[PDB]
Amino acid sequence: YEHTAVMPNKVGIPYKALVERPGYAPVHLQIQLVNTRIIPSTNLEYITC
Amino acid sequence: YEHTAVMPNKVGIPYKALVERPGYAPVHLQIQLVNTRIIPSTNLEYITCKYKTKVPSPVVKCCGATQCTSKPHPDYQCQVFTGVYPFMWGGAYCFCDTENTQMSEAYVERSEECSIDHAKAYKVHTGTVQAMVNITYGSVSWRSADVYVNGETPAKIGDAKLIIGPLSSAWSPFDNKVVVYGHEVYNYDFPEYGTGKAGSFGDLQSRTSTSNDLYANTNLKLQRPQAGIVHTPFTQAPSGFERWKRDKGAPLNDVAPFGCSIALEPLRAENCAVGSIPISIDIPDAAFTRISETPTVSDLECKITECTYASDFGGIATVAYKSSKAGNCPIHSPSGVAVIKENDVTLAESGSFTFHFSTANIHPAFKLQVCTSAVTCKGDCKPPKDHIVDYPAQHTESFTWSWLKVLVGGTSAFIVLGLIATAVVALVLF
Amino acid sequence: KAGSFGDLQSRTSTSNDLYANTNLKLQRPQAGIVHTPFTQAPSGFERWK
Amino acid sequence: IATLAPEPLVEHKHRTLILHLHPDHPTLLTTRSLGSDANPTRQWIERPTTVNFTVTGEGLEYTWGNHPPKRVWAQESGEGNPHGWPHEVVVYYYNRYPLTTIIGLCTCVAIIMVSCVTSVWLLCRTRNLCITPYKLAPNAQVPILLALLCCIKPTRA
Ligand SMILES: *[C@@H]1O[C@H](CO)[C@@H](O[C@@H]2O[C@H](CO)[C@@H](O[C@@H]3O[C@H](CO)[C@@H](O)[C@H](O)[C@H]3NC(C)=O)[C@H](O)[C@H]2NC(C)=O)[C@H](O)[C@H]1NC(C)=O
Ligand SMILES: *[C@@H]1O[C@H](CO)[C@@H](O)[C@H](O)[C@H]1NC(C)=O
């Protein structure tokens, strides 16, 4: 039942998928990507002023 | 109503057949062959174990010879020796220098471990297999009885009389010759009592533990003690019981076929799932319910709702029960396609009650006999995801058409088109 | 994965939080004696050396 | 008071146990494919090793040292035969039967080649015929060429 799901990157809205496990009752999702903060790899090269 | 039934040999799962006695209400079975312990016919041929060169203390004649004799001890190795000067606590003690004689003697004897830590050979014949068959029968709901396989033995434990086998699957996982060790059982071609080459398995060969006589081919060869000192060089192969514990083969409870477990207990080979068993029972007629007391269920409907194409009872199906009275109703699929968890379903006046089951064909077209009312629970099933736990309840795999029916009918249509092209040439010909 | 490299995964040395997939499975102590069966993969830092 | 080897890491695959494994000491692992084909295995494992076991339909058992013997249902996991495509989803039926489908398909490929060449002869011979009665008279006024339409071109009659 490991519910793989392609999923649009968009922040402020849930994505209520559905678990179709064969055998037991299905269960809904509610996946809201509340944030997409990134934090790339960087380097402080020089301050200027 | 003596319900004969061929029945697969497989241990840990019931076999809920259905008694179709003409005249009274049918009754379900629940036959779970909880065990398949075997206990072949055998013979203790010889214990073996590692020797102990329990040297008798050598003679030392000081001036002249001491002829040895071949005492009857097992592998009584004895060799006279001269040319010593035996340092014993005061330097030497025998005042001669070549007439100093030393007679070394050593025989083989069972270790103290031979009583307890010992391999054990056997000539193994077939014997007769057993089982603690539970039947939580009908409304009886219980009997857990030990039975046999030979096809005329009853066992009237509970209320039902039941005759089992003989099974068709005569594979004794034991070979003819077997060695046994504590719990690890080895289907080994042990050489024999009386013969075993030294170093090889069975260098010591005692009939039993008590048996003072034995066969000890250990290649025990005494050598002369060194430089005029008292001791006993015994040059000997460490036992073929020493090896056979660290250069051995693997155990039959780890290399057998067709699914067996083992014990150093009556020498059974438990739970050997293979083949079928022609089982037949004589139910107590008192346990029957007459037909005019169970609800008639016809004018019903059955359908799957979430069929799981699987082992665990994932298949389900509602049934639009259309009863006459209200009560219980034993159920079974006479087709082996579907195996059902529920033996019995309770019924109000024409309600609906889902049951659980398991199948192996994508389109399970299995009949369901709800207490004398058949129905096809046709449908379609879904594969699962999560397959690493013990053994199934399905055990019904067979041949399981989307490109075969009109395909091969189409394949035929090419060659069917032939003899309607040919012999129409005969018409154009005339 | 436990046993594999990075069974323990701490952000840094100070970081009290971490990820420890070690497959640590406690078993019951034997025959009425005080002790703690911890059944565990020696680390993927033990191997990797 | 005696030995025990650290628990295994069970990993699923299609009728196959990957087992990343990591003992304390050399551990004799062994199994018994419970078919009447036993096909057992033995190997002392001291070095951590990801191993594999072709589990069958009916079951296998697994003995991580003197840790008790495990057991495993490996029925399918290759998804049977649902259907909404033409044939690339039939791999599901192949992935469950990669012994009988290779021959069962080649059988299905064979019989169509049988049904091909038999259809070749019992068309082309019968196309060679029904023109030999017709295209030898060569006027041959019969507009029921419309039964072969592989040997063609009447004479406007
Ligand atoms: C008879 O066939 C049965 C097939 O399932 C099995 O019998 C099982 O025996 C168990 C022990 O007697 C029962 O467990 C107990 O059930 C009660 C009622 O549910 C619980 O209160 C108990 O806690 C529970 N015991 C434990 C230790 O959990 C099973 O209920 C019972 N099976 C059924 C269906 O009732 C056996 O396979 C077989 N009996 C044998 C071989 O003795
Ligand atoms: C499966 O295990 C075997 C070891 O017998 C190995 O050779 C093979 O690469 C493994 N396959 C995997 C991990 O996909």
Author numbering:
A (entry chain A): 1 to 49
B (entry chain G): 1 to 400, 408 to 437
C (entry chain D): 197 to 245
D (entry chain H): 264 to 420
Task: Please quote the authors directly.
Here, we report a 4.4-Å cryoelectron microscopy (cryo-EM) structure of eastern equine encephalitis virus (EEEV), an alphavirus that causes fatal encephalitis in humans. Alphaviruses utilize the E2 protein for attachment to incompletely characterized receptors (Schwartz and Albert, 2010, Zhang et al., 2018).
To gain insight into the molecular organization of encephalitic alphaviruses, we determined a cryo-EM structure of an EEEV virion derived from a SINV-EEEV chimeric virus to a resolution varying from 3.5 to 6.5 Å, corresponding to an average resolution of 4.4 Å. The EEEV cryo-EM map shows overall conservation of structural features among alphaviruses. The capsid molecules near icosahedral 5-fold axes have a resolution of ∼3.5 Å. EEEV neurovirulence, HS binding phenotype, and avoidance of lymphotropism are linked to three basic residues, Lys71, Lys74, and Lys77 (“Lys-triad”), on the E2 ectodomain (Gardner et al., 2011, Gardner et al., 2013). The EEEV cryo-EM map accommodates an N-acetyl-glucosamine monosaccharide at the E2 site and a disaccharide at the E1 site. The icosahedral capsid shell in EEEV consists of an outer layer formed by the chymotrypsin-like CTD and an inner layer formed by the extended NTD.
